[PDB]
Structure 1
Amino acid sequence: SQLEIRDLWASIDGETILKGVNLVVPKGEVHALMGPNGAGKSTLGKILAGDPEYTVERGEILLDGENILELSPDERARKGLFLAFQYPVEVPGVTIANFLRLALQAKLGREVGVAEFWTKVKKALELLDWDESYLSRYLNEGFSGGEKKRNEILQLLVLEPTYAVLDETDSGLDIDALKVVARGVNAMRGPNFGALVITHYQRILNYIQPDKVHVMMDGRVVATGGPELALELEAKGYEWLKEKVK
């Protein structure tokens, strides 16, 4: 009934990056994970995804009670953790529709007929208020990050994961990009879904209201609170918080 990071310690090259991360996201809630940058938030994201370059020194990551650290990225997704399907940006002639079908079939482990595919796609489009013509565009036509986000949010809704970890730090203050992710996350809100939105700026949190905010510093969570914490952090800055936790 929750996604829990418990006393997680992780390194890369003997250098310890995560230093005892504790973070619980109850299914049904949407949390935010903030940090100054280099504090380890995007590293946590990569470890949740299974990036092999990292070494877990101690701790666990439990998804509904099961530790998934020893599972492959593929197995984690089967357990419900959202894992967007990656494909080379330079490959032409791939409609977004064919790609989504490929992604859904990979996650479900079986063929998906046209009725099941389009029914799921249509509901997703209805939730995002997007036109079905979009599915006829080619994957990566514009080689842009904004296009990558929109396409991954479509996957989020069609694949229906139980938990999703979304790192939006790369979008910075690009409002359109933050709003696309917010639309998708808000559309997925419900008792069978939990999410962790990773971000440096508080901006996206005005579109995605979090139930809880966790703030990392020097590889561990040093403060937690409601949305007001992200707000005070945005007004005063991270240096402020660093001292206040003392």
Structure 2
Amino acid sequence: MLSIKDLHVSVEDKAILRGLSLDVHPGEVHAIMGPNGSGKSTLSATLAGREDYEVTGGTVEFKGKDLLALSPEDRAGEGIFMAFQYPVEIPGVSNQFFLQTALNAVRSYRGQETLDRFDFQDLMEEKIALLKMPEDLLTRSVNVGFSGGEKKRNDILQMAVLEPELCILDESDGLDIDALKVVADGVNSLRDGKRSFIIVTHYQRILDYIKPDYVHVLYQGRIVKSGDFTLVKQLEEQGYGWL
């Protein structure tokens, strides 16, 4: 699915990623962790041309295509997904209306028939039901004490509704145990055999919440070590738990 080789990226003329290599195939959950600023977020921000850093070298292929070629919106069409923010107070454009426009934008790109207001309503009912999500998630409002996990419920819902091939997840930002708990839960609820996930995180704890297929340790823009979901233990036993 995804194959990154010798990736070199720069942000504000400064080297962040210095030759990263990483292969992701269908049905796998990869956990990437390590000391922040060492390349955990800019990596994820590169698989989606959202921000505009600069790839100095290396290659990134996605299903046999130069992913670095497409634009952020076109990578969405190809299957690469990353949670986004709903527009603010735009008359006529509710959260559900926009989610629906996003889903159809990708179906048409894919050459599929767009969903109407009703069959999309049916769809939203399913995922909200499958992910045991608050039925009024797209119009609800909550107290600051719930905001954490709330943004995340909205992120997973986008992931359920958008039928992504590979979803990038940046969980490095507050100690929210409830929020991390919704991330881990959504992913598990969304792990068939064809979808892949790249979860980036500094606070390595959600690992013991989803049981990744692979775990990679990132230091100064380079995967330094990687194994299964036991890697954490193998390290603390080999005398390298500090990593």
TM-score normalised to structure 2 length: 0.86
Query: In the alignment, residue 115 of structure 1 is paired with which amino acid?
Result: F
Which residue is equivalent to 1:244? Answer: none
Percent sequence identity is 51
Q: Separation in 1 of the partners of 2:156 and 2:89?
A: 20
The 8 Å contact of residues 8 and 55 in structure 2, kept in 1 or not, is answered as yes
Which 10-residue stretch deviates more, 232-241 or 104-113?
232-241
> Is the alpha carbon distance of 1:137 and 1:105 closer, same or farther for their aligned partners in structure 2, counting shifts above 3 Å?
farther
Q: Separation in 2 of the partners of 1:237 and 1:147?
A: 39
The 8 Å contact of residues 232 and 241 in structure 2, kept in 1 or not, is answered as no
- The two structures, once aligned, show a CA RMSD in angstroms of 2.8
How does 1:110-125 map onto structure 2 within 5 Å?
Answer: 111-125=114-128
Which 10-residue stretch deviates more, 158-167 or 104-113?
104-113
2:159 counterpart (156, 172, 188): 156
1:211 counterpart (210, 213, 225): 213
1:84 Cα offset (Å)? 3.1
Which residue is equivalent to 2:45? Answer: 46
Which residue is equivalent to 2:72? Answer: 73
Q: Are 1:37 and 2:30 matched, yes or no?
A: no
1:111 Cα offset (Å)? 4.9
The 8 Å contact of residues 96 and 137 in structure 1, kept in 2 or not, is answered as no
Q: Separation in 1 of the partners of 2:164 and 2:143?
A: 26
2:227 counterpart (208, 225, 228): 225
Question: Is there any run of 5+ residues in structure 2 with no aligned partner, and where?
Answer: none
How does 1:180-199 map onto structure 2 within 5 Å?
Answer: 180-199=182-201
The 8 Å contact of residues 3 and 26 in structure 1, kept in 2 or not, is answered as yes
> Is the alpha carbon distance of 1:161 and 1:103 closer, same or farther for their aligned partners in structure 2, counting shifts above 3 Å?
same
Which residue is equivalent to 1:19? Answer: 18
What per-residue deviation string (whole Å, max 9, x for no partner) do you get for residues 200-241 of structure 1?
122111221100100111110110011122356689998833
What per-residue deviation string (whole Å, max 9, x for no partner) do you get for residues 119-148 of structure 1?
22122112211242334426x896944322
> Is the alpha carbon distance of 1:159 and 1:196 closer, same or farther for their aligned partners in structure 2, counting shifts above 3 Å?
same
Question: Is there any run of 5+ residues in structure 1 with no aligned partner, and where?
Answer: 242-246
Q: Identify, as 1 or 2, the structure richer in helix.
A: 1
Count how many residue pairs are aligned between Structure 1 and Structure 2.
238
